[PDB]
Amino acid sequence: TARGTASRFLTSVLHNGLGRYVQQLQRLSFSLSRDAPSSRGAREFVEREVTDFARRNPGVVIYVNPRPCCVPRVVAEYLNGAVREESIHCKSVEEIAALVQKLADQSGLDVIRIRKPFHTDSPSIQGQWHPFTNKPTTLGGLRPREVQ
């Protein structure tokens, strides 16, 4: 609900994408069990896809730990200092894949109501409206009833 949450204007992290675009995702930590069924999809993903994804994205580090865990989890972390938590719990390979790619393309910025779609610095080129702008001046700059 709008009045429930915070908000943020639309923004770039460190003015990203202007000079050169920099993938904002820093590291990923997968935790799964070699044994448990819950991790099943995320095991297969680790086999086949992870390798290639790593090659897809040099900028991100990937830490993959089998541990005795019952709920498969992946934790994104961002240059923004932001961290995001996720469950890969009981998902397909296709599913996981799509999700990691979601994490890949995010700001790291928080998901909150974004007040308006456009962030513009100095929208006002050629002027910014003020009351007088369309009013004709008179001779001597006199008032309505002022005399000289």
Partner 1 sequence: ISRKWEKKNKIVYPPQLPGEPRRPAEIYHCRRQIKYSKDKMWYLAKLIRGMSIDQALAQLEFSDKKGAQIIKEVLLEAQDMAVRDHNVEFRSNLYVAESTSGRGQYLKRIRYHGRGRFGIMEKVFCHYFVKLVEGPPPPREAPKTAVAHAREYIQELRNRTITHAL
* Of 3, 116, 130, 145, the one binding partner 1 by CB under 8 A: 116
The CB-of-130 to partner 1 minimum distance in angstroms stands at: 11
Q: From residue 88, how far is each of 3, 10, 133, 135, 141 by CA, in Å?
A: 31, 29, 59, 64, 72
β-partners of residue 87 are: 73
The residue range among 14-22, 65-73, 80-88, 116-124 that interacts with partner 1, by the rule CB under 8 A, is: 116-124
* Of 4, 6, 118, 140, the one binding partner 1 by CB under 8 A: 118
* Of 120, 126, 133, 134, the one binding partner 1 by CB under 8 A: 120
Count CB atoms within 10 A of the CB of residue 108.
18
* Of 58, 68, 123, 127, the one binding partner 1 by CB under 8 A: 123
Q: Are 35 and 72 in contact (CB under 8 A)?
A: no
**By CB under 8 A, residue 143 contacts partner 1:** no
The residue range among 13-21, 50-58, 60-68, 117-125 that interacts with partner 1, by the rule CB under 8 A, is: 117-125
**By CB under 8 A, residue 67 contacts partner 1:** no
Separation between Cα atoms, residue 26 and residue 21, nearest integer Å: 14
Nearer to partner 1, 55 or 116 (CB): 116
Burial class for 109, CB neighbours closer than 10 Å (0-12, 13-18, 19+): middle
Q: What is the token pair recorded at 16?
A: 């990203």
Where do contacts with partner 1 occur on this chain (CB under 8 A)? 116, 118-120, 123
